[PDB]
Amino acid sequence: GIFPVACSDGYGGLVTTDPKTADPVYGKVFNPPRNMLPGRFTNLLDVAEACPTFLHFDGDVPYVTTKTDSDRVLAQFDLSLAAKHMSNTFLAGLAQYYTQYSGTVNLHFMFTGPTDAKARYMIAIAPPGMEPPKTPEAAAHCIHAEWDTGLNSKFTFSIPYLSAADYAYTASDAAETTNVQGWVCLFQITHGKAEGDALVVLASAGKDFELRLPVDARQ
Amino acid sequence: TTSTGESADPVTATVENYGGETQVQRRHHTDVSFILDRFVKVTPKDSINVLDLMQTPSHTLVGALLRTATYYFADLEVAVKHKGDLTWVPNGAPVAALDNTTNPTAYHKAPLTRLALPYTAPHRVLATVYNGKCKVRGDLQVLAQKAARPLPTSFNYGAIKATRVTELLYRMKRAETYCPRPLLAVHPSAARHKQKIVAP
């Protein structure tokens, strides 16, 4: 007698993401040495933290010039990785292959104009449930920060992760109503002789950004 | 045994009140994990199916026993009988991804194909009932409210698509249940409602 076994129904098909291996055909092959080559990366979320990329504003330019008039809003957009202003960064390009995310997103602002032009800015976040503010006075009641130009020409602000659920979606190109995660608003408080000077802005991941559930929508 | 009624406190009276005897109990068959661990049939659709645990009929064993909980959690197993190849897609993903092969695809092998899927919703727990809707135009309001009192859309385990789907069965693992609800039996018309037991 030999060991009796019972072949089972519904088991053993092919699945394209199973955790098991194939059978070897060609043996005893040795590789050329490749140890310590320059420039390695293991997690795709470390080049997203070490290297930020430019935003996209109306006109195909990654910056916003100071206005000389009674309207003080520089740029305003929804908070989503599928937004139009984020369509060229490394963050959105990578996030289009996952379904959910959570954590912080960083923004960097750099001032360019000459040594005798000065300015002052402010940035706020408006959570969902009420239309966003149009004036700095009204936005002064949200979570905000405020800086100005000097010897150090850069600033960094972290958009907090605030929601009911523990994770949030990266999908749903809206082209419609019903914002879900809120807006962010950049304002210009005042300025001295800085007409035409630009402020470039970049984006990158945060300390505790996370990304889960890979998918393939052919983008 | 007398007590105050309004107090709403539990009180139980044994048979030792009038000289009886209290015996041994074995309650293995009523555990939630045990009883909810079995397959249940579901009416499938031809091309695209959304795996949602509220599609089991309310009269079956699993359907009603599930519906006497307000919140729940479980993993999932499905058993599908199809033609072609079967593609699964996680919670909250675009509907274009149902055509791509890199997503977990099981090539046809007769007679059927049994899988095991995780829990992929963003909430900490799911719900069987939800009070969100906060509740001439006679028919208008009827069919407006009737479609304005379903559950939210993120209460699902994903989706599957195939060239044709013929059968589809659900099985829950590691079930947990919170906050019980009513559960009712068939109301007899006569003095008793009797099944015809096995007898010639």
């Epitope: 749903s172 | 509907v95 309001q141 069919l143 009737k146 304005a148 379903p150």
Partner: nanobody, 126 residues
Framework: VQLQESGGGLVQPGGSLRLSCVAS?????????????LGWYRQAPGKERELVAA???????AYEDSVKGRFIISRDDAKKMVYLQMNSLKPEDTAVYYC????????????????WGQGTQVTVSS
């Protein structure tokens, strides 16, 4: 993202029309579906555009009691098209029809949920 329609133009009252909704394809996003609730709107000259009918996800259909009982609506999801039947032609049909979707709020259906439509007009006058 923007729905096209066809089957309109200049037509005489008393015929038989079947307006057709040539959708852009409905690229619509994530598996959160079964909120597929389309509808039809009419628009009057200088007067606010009014609803006509609305179709629910599977089978329910309501109409404005002005046209109630006279029109028939149905959708074909297997090919993803929706149409509008026009029988019992009256002088009241002179309006531009928009094939669009609905919101299904607690009080009543809300509009798009879209950018806008183009429309097709059926003005009949004898």
């Amino acid at each position: 993202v923007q729905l096209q329609e066809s089957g309109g133009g200049l037509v005489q009252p008393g015929g038989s029309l079947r307006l057709s909704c040539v959708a852009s394809g409905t690229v619509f996003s994530i598996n959160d579906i079964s909120i597929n609730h389309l509808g039809w709107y009419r628009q009057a000259p200088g007067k606010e555009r009014e609803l006509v009918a609305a179709i629910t996800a599977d089978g329910t259909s309501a109409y404005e009691d002005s046209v109630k009982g006279r029109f028939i609506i149905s959708r074909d999801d297997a090919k993803k098209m929706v149409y509008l039947q026009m029988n019992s032609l009256k002088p009241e049909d002179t309006a531009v029809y928009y094939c669009n979707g609905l919101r299904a709020s607690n009080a009543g259906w809300e509009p798009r949920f879209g950018t806008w439509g183009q429309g097709t007009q059926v003005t009949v006058s004898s």
